[PDB]
Amino acid sequence: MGIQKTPQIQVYSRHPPENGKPNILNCYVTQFHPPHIEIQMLKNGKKIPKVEMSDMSFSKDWSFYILAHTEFTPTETDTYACRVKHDSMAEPKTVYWDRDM
Amino acid sequence: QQVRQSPQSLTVWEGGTTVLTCSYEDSTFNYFPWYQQFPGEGPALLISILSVSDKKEDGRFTTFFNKREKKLSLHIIDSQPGDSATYFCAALYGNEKITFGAGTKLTIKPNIQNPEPAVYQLKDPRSQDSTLCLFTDFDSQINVPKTMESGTFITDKCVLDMKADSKSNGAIAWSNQTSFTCQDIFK
Amino acid sequence: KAVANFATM
Amino acid sequence: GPHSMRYFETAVSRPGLEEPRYISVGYVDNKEFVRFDSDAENPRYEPRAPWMEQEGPEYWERETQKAKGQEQWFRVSLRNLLGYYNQSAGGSHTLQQMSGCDLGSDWRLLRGYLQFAYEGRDYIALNEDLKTWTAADMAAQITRRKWEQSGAAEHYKAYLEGECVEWLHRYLKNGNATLLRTDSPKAHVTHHPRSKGEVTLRCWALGFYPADITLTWQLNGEELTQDMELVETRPAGDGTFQKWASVVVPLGKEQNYTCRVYHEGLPEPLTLRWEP
Amino acid sequence: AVTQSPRSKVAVTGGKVTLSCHQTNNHDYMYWYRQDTGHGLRLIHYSYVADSTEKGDIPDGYKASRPSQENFSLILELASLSQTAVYFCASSDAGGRNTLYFGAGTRLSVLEDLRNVTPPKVSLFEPSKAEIANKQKATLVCLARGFFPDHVELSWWVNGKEVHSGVCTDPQAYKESNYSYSLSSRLRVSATFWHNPRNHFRCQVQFHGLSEEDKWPEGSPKPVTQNISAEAWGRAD
């Protein structure tokens, strides 16, 4: 058989962000199939080591979803991002954290 | 153990209704298959029922399930010689392994119409003096006596059916002497 | 409690 | 009110030496309550909601044995499917199942479900009669014939009309307090010059449970239906959810627009505006 | 189909025995069960995949082996007396509620000394003239004596083809002494059938003894598995 689904990604903070204050950065990845996926979180282009993954689950349309997360302290200058590789895509997809979204 | 099947053996008259019963311990059991085993063959699935149902009928065989008493039964109407076999009840839950009962051995025997007992001596022609004794055409109620003596052997009642009218009970005896005769040994 | 599948595909 | 139970099961084959990974997740009213994962050091069904701690050791032992059986069932089924489709070895393949029941407030079974997917595509499903099968492609016709010949549907019907319903009732009784909990959204509006004399107004809702929510924008008492961008509702990661909705508006007119938030937890819907 | 091999086995105590099962059902589960004097199906071992096995209810003294999807063997490394029983192989799809498909069984006798293994003498006793006169029927009696152990099957053959009508064979061999069994059977036909010289009657006793795995020294006949028959023709006497 075979119908692939391309992952949808959101990157956002658990709590309202304020610079210099400890918080949790989330990378929520949905609507993907097959379930094998690779997800990294980045601080200024560097792999964050501590990253936790939720258990994987699937939706009523058969597509999988997962939440990756890590501690972070936003500052004014630093960039954060989630990078995802999946077989539905030729290339990895990187989505930057934007504190207004 | 979890599936209790009694008795070990049962005889029912030809044409009669056979009732076999089992009980189980685990009230969550929900699938109940019966297996039938003929001599020299393996068991084969006869009939099965799920715990949502009260009964399942297939030809002359009906199985009943009673959740309240935790009892399974198998009814055979118009019981025939070809139904002579060992019947195993079984039970399980979900996809767990089957549990078999110990099996009941069923023998369907005719209630002979017009009995006419006789005892004959037969000889083996490839022998000097070898003979045996045949007791045939006797009543189904009669008890065939057992040997009260070593060297002498008496078989159990064996029912035959010539298929064209002609069912008959039989028993055979032989010994290791001239001092036994046939008309004595069978009573 | 979960379903217990019967015959395989 | 209505209630549901579902078990969502996944087996995924792996090209190496390892057997397929098997995961089963149970839900009551869309809330995860048990889980089994063959990759755990001690694979067993585990409680995932506090109200499942009422069940005795035999509940977990017997469900675990069931999962073990399902795991073999899926390994065999995966092998058979690989043959049906003439697929090469040394790949990875996914088989999924969803099963369960929807009930009314009178505990009547409203619908039973039993469906499978292979490689993310519908494969076979039990129809609503709980007697006949819908098979999606050529391979699934083989499975359908096999299942019709063995009378498979009557076993699934017995489960869906019997055990599914009765266990759902037990779980809802045990989990009543917990399943009714709600956390209300806190909302606020932010203002973002994107421009050409335009601003994005973004209405945020935060910290709410369950995930069901509706956000609307309006101008002069009409809801803005087409103009509004949304994000998918997302987990904060502490058990609560987040969402926002935004509209693009002319600079100088921001005060004309109001956001409304509808959520089960609230005593009434929230109404709010950009507060400069 | 599920087919077991061998049909019958006689082994020495302390000897090694392998029972084999071959299934062409494309099933994944296979099972070995023990039945004792016709009662019970007690699971010894089972297997759900090539190369591994799982303990059943009564695994002690037995090993199992699953060298392929089709084959599942039961192994008795040191056969004891207590392992004398009938063994049945089965297959199923995925176990649980899936129907079990069984082989036809293997009878195993374990003995202290194989020199006791002895085929039957088979004798055909001819019908009494009094029976033919008084009842217009003729009962032939077949008697197999002096055999050990009790793995015999008796059949009747009329004009070269097996009959079931008019036959009753004892269900159990009768133990005459420690190492000696007897079995009887009778075939009843009409006086006129017996009186026809064109009719040939044969009692066949299938004895299961040793096989060609068993070595036997030079002095005496090897008590192998074999058919032994006695015969008679009808006569207008």
PDB file of N, CA and C in Angstrom, chain D residues 126-199:
ATOM      1  N   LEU D 126     -14.560  -3.218   9.250  1.00  0.00           N
ATOM      2  CA  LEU D 126     -15.820  -3.852   9.556  1.00  0.00           C
ATOM      3  C   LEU D 126     -16.920  -2.803   9.324  1.00  0.00           C
ATOM      4  N   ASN D 127     -17.953  -3.145   8.569  1.00  0.00           N
ATOM      5  CA  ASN D 127     -19.020  -2.181   8.333  1.00  0.00           C
ATOM      6  C   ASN D 127     -19.873  -2.019   9.608  1.00  0.00           C
ATOM      7  N   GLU D 128     -20.745  -1.028   9.577  1.00  0.00           N
ATOM      8  CA  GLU D 128     -21.530  -0.659  10.734  1.00  0.00           C
ATOM      9  C   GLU D 128     -22.491  -1.804  11.129  1.00  0.00           C
ATOM     10  N   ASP D 129     -22.862  -2.675  10.193  1.00  0.00           N
ATOM     11  CA  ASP D 129     -23.638  -3.875  10.558  1.00  0.00           C
ATOM     12  C   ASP D 129     -22.896  -4.856  11.485  1.00  0.00           C
ATOM     13  N   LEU D 130     -21.582  -4.723  11.584  1.00  0.00           N
ATOM     14  CA  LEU D 130     -20.752  -5.593  12.381  1.00  0.00           C
ATOM     15  C   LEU D 130     -20.801  -7.023  11.846  1.00  0.00           C
ATOM     16  N   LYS D 131     -21.102  -7.145  10.561  1.00  0.00           N
ATOM     17  CA  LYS D 131     -21.238  -8.451   9.881  1.00  0.00           C
ATOM     18  C   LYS D 131     -20.448  -8.565   8.588  1.00  0.00           C
ATOM     19  N   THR D 132     -20.309  -7.479   7.844  1.00  0.00           N
ATOM     20  CA  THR D 132     -19.654  -7.511   6.538  1.00  0.00           C
ATOM     21  C   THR D 132     -18.455  -6.574   6.532  1.00  0.00           C
ATOM     22  N   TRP D 133     -17.549  -6.851   5.601  1.00  0.00           N
ATOM     23  CA  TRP D 133     -16.297  -6.112   5.476  1.00  0.00           C
ATOM     24  C   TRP D 133     -16.224  -5.192   4.246  1.00  0.00           C
ATOM     25  N   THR D 134     -15.615  -4.018   4.409  1.00  0.00           N
ATOM     26  CA  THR D 134     -15.218  -3.197   3.275  1.00  0.00           C
ATOM     27  C   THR D 134     -13.701  -3.290   3.073  1.00  0.00           C
ATOM     28  N   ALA D 135     -13.296  -3.750   1.904  1.00  0.00           N
ATOM     29  CA  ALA D 135     -11.913  -3.946   1.596  1.00  0.00           C
ATOM     30  C   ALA D 135     -11.537  -2.937   0.546  1.00  0.00           C
ATOM     31  N   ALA D 136     -10.415  -2.251   0.756  1.00  0.00           N
ATOM     32  CA  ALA D 136     -10.047  -1.070  -0.052  1.00  0.00           C
ATOM     33  C   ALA D 136      -9.316  -1.375  -1.368  1.00  0.00           C
ATOM     34  N   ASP D 137      -8.585  -2.480  -1.455  1.00  0.00           N
ATOM     35  CA  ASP D 137      -7.745  -2.747  -2.631  1.00  0.00           C
ATOM     36  C   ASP D 137      -7.657  -4.247  -2.870  1.00  0.00           C
ATOM     37  N   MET D 138      -6.842  -4.673  -3.834  1.00  0.00           N
ATOM     38  CA  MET D 138      -6.802  -6.073  -4.253  1.00  0.00           C
ATOM     39  C   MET D 138      -6.354  -6.985  -3.130  1.00  0.00           C
ATOM     40  N   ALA D 139      -5.308  -6.581  -2.430  1.00  0.00           N
ATOM     41  CA  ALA D 139      -4.770  -7.364  -1.328  1.00  0.00           C
ATOM     42  C   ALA D 139      -5.804  -7.605  -0.228  1.00  0.00           C
ATOM     43  N   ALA D 140      -6.465  -6.528   0.174  1.00  0.00           N
ATOM     44  CA  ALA D 140      -7.529  -6.598   1.171  1.00  0.00           C
ATOM     45  C   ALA D 140      -8.702  -7.526   0.804  1.00  0.00           C
ATOM     46  N   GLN D 141      -8.913  -7.760  -0.489  1.00  0.00           N
ATOM     47  CA  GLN D 141      -9.878  -8.771  -0.947  1.00  0.00           C
ATOM     48  C   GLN D 141      -9.483 -10.163  -0.476  1.00  0.00           C
ATOM     49  N   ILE D 142      -8.185 -10.451  -0.409  1.00  0.00           N
ATOM     50  CA  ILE D 142      -7.675 -11.741   0.066  1.00  0.00           C
ATOM     51  C   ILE D 142      -8.000 -11.891   1.552  1.00  0.00           C
ATOM     52  N   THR D 143      -7.633 -10.860   2.332  1.00  0.00           N
ATOM     53  CA  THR D 143      -8.003 -10.804   3.735  1.00  0.00           C
ATOM     54  C   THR D 143      -9.531 -10.918   3.961  1.00  0.00           C
ATOM     55  N   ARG D 144     -10.317 -10.153   3.208  1.00  0.00           N
ATOM     56  CA  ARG D 144     -11.778 -10.212   3.367  1.00  0.00           C
ATOM     57  C   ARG D 144     -12.304 -11.670   3.190  1.00  0.00           C
ATOM     58  N   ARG D 145     -11.856 -12.335   2.119  1.00  0.00           N
ATOM     59  CA  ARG D 145     -12.287 -13.726   1.842  1.00  0.00           C
ATOM     60  C   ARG D 145     -11.887 -14.671   2.946  1.00  0.00           C
ATOM     61  N   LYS D 146     -10.660 -14.537   3.412  1.00  0.00           N
ATOM     62  CA  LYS D 146     -10.177 -15.286   4.536  1.00  0.00           C
ATOM     63  C   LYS D 146     -11.051 -15.076   5.795  1.00  0.00           C
ATOM     64  N   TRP D 147     -11.387 -13.829   6.089  1.00  0.00           N
ATOM     65  CA  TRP D 147     -12.184 -13.519   7.256  1.00  0.00           C
ATOM     66  C   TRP D 147     -13.654 -13.925   7.156  1.00  0.00           C
ATOM     67  N   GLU D 148     -14.223 -13.822   5.968  1.00  0.00           N
ATOM     68  CA  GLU D 148     -15.590 -14.322   5.719  1.00  0.00           C
ATOM     69  C   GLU D 148     -15.619 -15.841   5.898  1.00  0.00           C
ATOM     70  N   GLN D 149     -14.643 -16.534   5.322  1.00  0.00           N
ATOM     71  CA  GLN D 149     -14.562 -17.996   5.400  1.00  0.00           C
ATOM     72  C   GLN D 149     -14.397 -18.486   6.875  1.00  0.00           C
ATOM     73  N   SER D 150     -13.699 -17.736   7.724  1.00  0.00           N
ATOM     74  CA  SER D 150     -13.511 -18.180   9.111  1.00  0.00           C
ATOM     75  C   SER D 150     -14.520 -17.592  10.076  1.00  0.00           C
ATOM     76  N   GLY D 151     -15.434 -16.768   9.580  1.00  0.00           N
ATOM     77  CA  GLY D 151     -16.442 -16.173  10.415  1.00  0.00           C
ATOM     78  C   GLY D 151     -15.856 -15.205  11.424  1.00  0.00           C
ATOM     79  N   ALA D 152     -14.788 -14.510  11.040  1.00  0.00           N
ATOM     80  CA  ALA D 152     -14.144 -13.541  11.900  1.00  0.00           C
ATOM     81  C   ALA D 152     -15.036 -12.432  12.436  1.00  0.00           C
ATOM     82  N   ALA D 153     -15.948 -11.901  11.611  1.00  0.00           N
ATOM     83  CA  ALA D 153     -16.797 -10.780  12.046  1.00  0.00           C
ATOM     84  C   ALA D 153     -17.612 -11.079  13.326  1.00  0.00           C
ATOM     85  N   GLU D 154     -18.067 -12.304  13.540  1.00  0.00           N
ATOM     86  CA  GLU D 154     -18.869 -12.560  14.737  1.00  0.00           C
ATOM     87  C   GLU D 154     -18.076 -12.422  16.040  1.00  0.00           C
ATOM     88  N   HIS D 155     -16.769 -12.696  15.998  1.00  0.00           N
ATOM     89  CA  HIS D 155     -15.927 -12.483  17.164  1.00  0.00           C
ATOM     90  C   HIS D 155     -15.777 -10.996  17.442  1.00  0.00           C
ATOM     91  N   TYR D 156     -15.591 -10.198  16.400  1.00  0.00           N
ATOM     92  CA  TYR D 156     -15.453  -8.744  16.622  1.00  0.00           C
ATOM     93  C   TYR D 156     -16.785  -8.113  17.069  1.00  0.00           C
ATOM     94  N   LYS D 157     -17.895  -8.584  16.504  1.00  0.00           N
ATOM     95  CA  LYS D 157     -19.208  -8.107  16.912  1.00  0.00           C
ATOM     96  C   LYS D 157     -19.451  -8.390  18.409  1.00  0.00           C
ATOM     97  N   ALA D 158     -19.167  -9.640  18.846  1.00  0.00           N
ATOM     98  CA  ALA D 158     -19.291 -10.004  20.275  1.00  0.00           C
ATOM     99  C   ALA D 158     -18.485  -9.059  21.193  1.00  0.00           C
ATOM    100  N   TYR D 159     -17.211  -8.806  20.863  1.00  0.00           N
ATOM    101  CA  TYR D 159     -16.392  -7.823  21.578  1.00  0.00           C
ATOM    102  C   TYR D 159     -17.016  -6.392  21.639  1.00  0.00           C
ATOM    103  N   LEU D 160     -17.402  -5.894  20.473  1.00  0.00           N
ATOM    104  CA  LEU D 160     -17.876  -4.519  20.350  1.00  0.00           C
ATOM    105  C   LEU D 160     -19.218  -4.270  21.034  1.00  0.00           C
ATOM    106  N   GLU D 161     -20.104  -5.273  21.015  1.00  0.00           N
ATOM    107  CA  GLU D 161     -21.438  -5.187  21.646  1.00  0.00           C
ATOM    108  C   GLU D 161     -21.423  -5.619  23.102  1.00  0.00           C
ATOM    109  N   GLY D 162     -20.388  -6.359  23.493  1.00  0.00           N
ATOM    110  CA  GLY D 162     -20.301  -6.912  24.827  1.00  0.00           C
ATOM    111  C   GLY D 162     -19.196  -6.254  25.627  1.00  0.00           C
ATOM    112  N   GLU D 163     -18.016  -6.837  25.578  1.00  0.00           N
ATOM    113  CA  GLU D 163     -16.927  -6.351  26.406  1.00  0.00           C
ATOM    114  C   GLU D 163     -16.619  -4.844  26.249  1.00  0.00           C
ATOM    115  N   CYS D 164     -16.622  -4.334  25.031  1.00  0.00           N
ATOM    116  CA  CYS D 164     -16.263  -2.939  24.795  1.00  0.00           C
ATOM    117  C   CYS D 164     -17.165  -2.022  25.607  1.00  0.00           C
ATOM    118  N   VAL D 165     -18.467  -2.263  25.490  1.00  0.00           N
ATOM    119  CA  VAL D 165     -19.496  -1.503  26.164  1.00  0.00           C
ATOM    120  C   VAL D 165     -19.405  -1.600  27.675  1.00  0.00           C
ATOM    121  N   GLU D 166     -19.293  -2.822  28.175  1.00  0.00           N
ATOM    122  CA  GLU D 166     -19.267  -3.068  29.595  1.00  0.00           C
ATOM    123  C   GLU D 166     -18.016  -2.530  30.295  1.00  0.00           C
ATOM    124  N   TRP D 167     -16.861  -2.687  29.674  1.00  0.00           N
ATOM    125  CA  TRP D 167     -15.651  -2.145  30.244  1.00  0.00           C
ATOM    126  C   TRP D 167     -15.659  -0.606  30.199  1.00  0.00           C
ATOM    127  N   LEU D 168     -16.167  -0.033  29.102  1.00  0.00           N
ATOM    128  CA  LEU D 168     -16.272   1.432  29.001  1.00  0.00           C
ATOM    129  C   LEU D 168     -17.080   1.958  30.198  1.00  0.00           C
ATOM    130  N   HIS D 169     -18.190   1.284  30.479  1.00  0.00           N
ATOM    131  CA  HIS D 169     -19.057   1.655  31.609  1.00  0.00           C
ATOM    132  C   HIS D 169     -18.274   1.592  32.917  1.00  0.00           C
ATOM    133  N   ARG D 170     -17.579   0.486  33.179  1.00  0.00           N
ATOM    134  CA  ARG D 170     -16.704   0.402  34.357  1.00  0.00           C
ATOM    135  C   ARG D 170     -15.679   1.567  34.462  1.00  0.00           C
ATOM    136  N   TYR D 171     -14.994   1.840  33.354  1.00  0.00           N
ATOM    137  CA  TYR D 171     -13.968   2.890  33.343  1.00  0.00           C
ATOM    138  C   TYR D 171     -14.568   4.291  33.634  1.00  0.00           C
ATOM    139  N   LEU D 172     -15.719   4.592  33.027  1.00  0.00           N
ATOM    140  CA  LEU D 172     -16.378   5.892  33.210  1.00  0.00           C
ATOM    141  C   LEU D 172     -16.825   6.054  34.659  1.00  0.00           C
ATOM    142  N   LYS D 173     -17.324   4.966  35.243  1.00  0.00           N
ATOM    143  CA  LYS D 173     -17.655   4.955  36.667  1.00  0.00           C
ATOM    144  C   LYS D 173     -16.431   5.248  37.534  1.00  0.00           C
ATOM    145  N   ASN D 174     -15.341   4.533  37.310  1.00  0.00           N
ATOM    146  CA  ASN D 174     -14.107   4.766  38.036  1.00  0.00           C
ATOM    147  C   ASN D 174     -13.468   6.135  37.779  1.00  0.00           C
ATOM    148  N   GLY D 175     -13.600   6.690  36.576  1.00  0.00           N
ATOM    149  CA  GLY D 175     -12.838   7.893  36.205  1.00  0.00           C
ATOM    150  C   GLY D 175     -13.636   9.186  36.145  1.00  0.00           C
ATOM    151  N   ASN D 176     -14.754   9.213  36.865  1.00  0.00           N
ATOM    152  CA  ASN D 176     -15.811  10.198  36.625  1.00  0.00           C
ATOM    153  C   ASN D 176     -15.373  11.621  36.937  1.00  0.00           C
ATOM    154  N   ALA D 177     -14.930  11.814  38.182  1.00  0.00           N
ATOM    155  CA  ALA D 177     -14.342  13.074  38.670  1.00  0.00           C
ATOM    156  C   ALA D 177     -13.281  13.622  37.715  1.00  0.00           C
ATOM    157  N   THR D 178     -12.293  12.779  37.434  1.00  0.00           N
ATOM    158  CA  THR D 178     -11.125  13.138  36.608  1.00  0.00           C
ATOM    159  C   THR D 178     -11.472  13.513  35.153  1.00  0.00           C
ATOM    160  N   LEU D 179     -12.320  12.698  34.516  1.00  0.00           N
ATOM    161  CA  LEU D 179     -12.742  12.923  33.113  1.00  0.00           C
ATOM    162  C   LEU D 179     -13.558  14.235  32.928  1.00  0.00           C
ATOM    163  N   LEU D 180     -14.272  14.682  33.966  1.00  0.00           N
ATOM    164  CA  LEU D 180     -15.008  15.957  33.905  1.00  0.00           C
ATOM    165  C   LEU D 180     -14.166  17.212  34.211  1.00  0.00           C
ATOM    166  N   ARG D 181     -12.889  17.077  34.590  1.00  0.00           N
ATOM    167  CA  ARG D 181     -12.086  18.267  34.950  1.00  0.00           C
ATOM    168  C   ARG D 181     -11.913  19.187  33.739  1.00  0.00           C
ATOM    169  N   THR D 182     -11.866  20.487  34.015  1.00  0.00           N
ATOM    170  CA  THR D 182     -11.610  21.489  32.997  1.00  0.00           C
ATOM    171  C   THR D 182     -10.670  22.548  33.573  1.00  0.00           C
ATOM    172  N   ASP D 183      -9.890  23.164  32.692  1.00  0.00           N
ATOM    173  CA  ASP D 183      -9.067  24.334  32.986  1.00  0.00           C
ATOM    174  C   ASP D 183      -9.485  25.359  31.949  1.00  0.00           C
ATOM    175  N   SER D 184      -9.858  26.532  32.418  1.00  0.00           N
ATOM    176  CA  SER D 184     -10.346  27.560  31.531  1.00  0.00           C
ATOM    177  C   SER D 184      -9.192  28.283  30.820  1.00  0.00           C
ATOM    178  N   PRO D 185      -9.412  28.736  29.563  1.00  0.00           N
ATOM    179  CA  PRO D 185      -8.401  29.555  28.911  1.00  0.00           C
ATOM    180  C   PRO D 185      -8.212  30.900  29.584  1.00  0.00           C
ATOM    181  N   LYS D 186      -6.970  31.365  29.647  1.00  0.00           N
ATOM    182  CA  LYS D 186      -6.661  32.798  29.861  1.00  0.00           C
ATOM    183  C   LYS D 186      -6.363  33.396  28.477  1.00  0.00           C
ATOM    184  N   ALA D 187      -6.956  34.538  28.171  1.00  0.00           N
ATOM    185  CA  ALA D 187      -6.846  35.130  26.857  1.00  0.00           C
ATOM    186  C   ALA D 187      -6.336  36.530  26.894  1.00  0.00           C
ATOM    187  N   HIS D 188      -5.686  36.908  25.808  1.00  0.00           N
ATOM    188  CA  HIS D 188      -5.223  38.277  25.648  1.00  0.00           C
ATOM    189  C   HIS D 188      -4.925  38.513  24.180  1.00  0.00           C
ATOM    190  N   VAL D 189      -4.916  39.787  23.792  1.00  0.00           N
ATOM    191  CA  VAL D 189      -4.684  40.176  22.408  1.00  0.00           C
ATOM    192  C   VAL D 189      -3.360  40.916  22.301  1.00  0.00           C
ATOM    193  N   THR D 190      -2.593  40.569  21.274  1.00  0.00           N
ATOM    194  CA  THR D 190      -1.356  41.247  20.936  1.00  0.00           C
ATOM    195  C   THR D 190      -1.501  41.874  19.548  1.00  0.00           C
ATOM    196  N   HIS D 191      -0.626  42.820  19.311  1.00  0.00           N
ATOM    197  CA  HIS D 191      -0.735  43.786  18.244  1.00  0.00           C
ATOM    198  C   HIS D 191       0.633  43.743  17.565  1.00  0.00           C
ATOM    199  N   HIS D 192       0.674  43.516  16.252  1.00  0.00           N
ATOM    200  CA  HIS D 192       1.935  43.317  15.533  1.00  0.00           C
ATOM    201  C   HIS D 192       1.861  44.110  14.288  1.00  0.00           C
ATOM    202  N   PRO D 193       2.582  45.254  14.257  1.00  0.00           N
ATOM    203  CA  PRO D 193       2.807  45.844  12.953  1.00  0.00           C
ATOM    204  C   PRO D 193       3.567  44.842  12.029  1.00  0.00           C
ATOM    205  N   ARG D 194       2.797  44.139  11.196  1.00  0.00           N
ATOM    206  CA  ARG D 194       3.115  43.882   9.779  1.00  0.00           C
ATOM    207  C   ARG D 194       2.585  45.175   9.199  1.00  0.00           C
ATOM    208  N   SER D 195       2.888  45.595   7.965  1.00  0.00           N
ATOM    209  CA  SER D 195       2.354  46.912   7.529  1.00  0.00           C
ATOM    210  C   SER D 195       2.050  47.142   6.038  1.00  0.00           C
ATOM    211  N   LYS D 196       2.324  48.355   5.533  1.00  0.00           N
ATOM    212  CA  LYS D 196       1.491  49.057   4.529  1.00  0.00           C
ATOM    213  C   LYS D 196       0.258  49.680   5.257  1.00  0.00           C
ATOM    214  N   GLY D 197       0.509  50.284   6.425  1.00  0.00           N
ATOM    215  CA  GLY D 197      -0.562  50.779   7.313  1.00  0.00           C
ATOM    216  C   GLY D 197      -1.517  49.728   7.894  1.00  0.00           C
ATOM    217  N   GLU D 198      -1.059  48.488   8.015  1.00  0.00           N
ATOM    218  CA  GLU D 198      -1.877  47.369   8.537  1.00  0.00           C
ATOM    219  C   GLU D 198      -1.253  46.773   9.798  1.00  0.00           C
ATOM    220  N   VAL D 199      -2.075  46.139  10.620  1.00  0.00           N
ATOM    221  CA  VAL D 199      -1.569  45.474  11.798  1.00  0.00           C
ATOM    222  C   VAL D 199      -2.238  44.090  11.862  1.00  0.00           C
TER     223      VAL D 199
END
